[PDB]
Amino acid sequence: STASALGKLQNVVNQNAQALNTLVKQLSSNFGAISSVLNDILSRLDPPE
Amino acid sequence: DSFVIRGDEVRQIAPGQTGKIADYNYKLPDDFTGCVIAWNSNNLDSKVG
């Protein structure tokens, strides 16, 4: 009946899942560029910039 | 390399340049190393007729 007794294993699983989630999330940032998607960058403007 | 061009279009002689001669007559590599020297020849390459 009582839950929340296996705190450590649940903590480990949650930490792993959260790390993976934020890693794949970080793919949608501009980082100071003008677009977060590379194909549009290639097909929108001139190669030197 | 040597040639004769209009005075206005000398801007097109540079790496990563777009234009008429830069795309249809003479193209420079993006990582070009060297020098370019241009000088007017109106008194010799131009005729009254």
Side-chain angles (χ1 to χ4, degrees):
Chain A
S1 75
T2 297
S4 75
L6 302 93
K8 316 186 175 181
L9 322 176
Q10 196 56 48
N11 187 13
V12 160
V13 173
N14 291 346
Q15 275 163 356
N16 288 349
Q18 196 205 33
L20 261 181
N21 194 260
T22 180
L23 170 69
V24 71
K25 180 70 66 66
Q26 278 276 133
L27 264 177
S28 167
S29 300
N30 293 356
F31 291 116
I34 65 168
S35 173
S36 164
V37 60
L38 190 151
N39 193 5
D40 190 359
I41 286 298
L42 280 185
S43 72
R44 175 177 296 178
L45 59 83
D46 188 70
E49 47 276 24
Chain B
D1 309 329
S2 63
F3 41 77
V4 169
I5 199 61
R6 322 298 310 283
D8 50 3
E9 214 179 2
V10 300
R11 188 269 299 163
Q12 282 194 31
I13 309 303
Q17 273 309 311
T18 56
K20 211 61 177 58
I21 64 175
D23 301 341
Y24 277 176
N25 300 84
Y26 191 36
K27 187 47 154 37
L28 284 185
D30 55 347
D31 54 353
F32 158 78
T33 181
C35 302
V36 56
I37 311 155
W39 40 268
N40 179 34
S41 70
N42 190 39
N43 297 115
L44 300 175
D45 284 329
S46 189
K47 269 211 304 182
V48 65

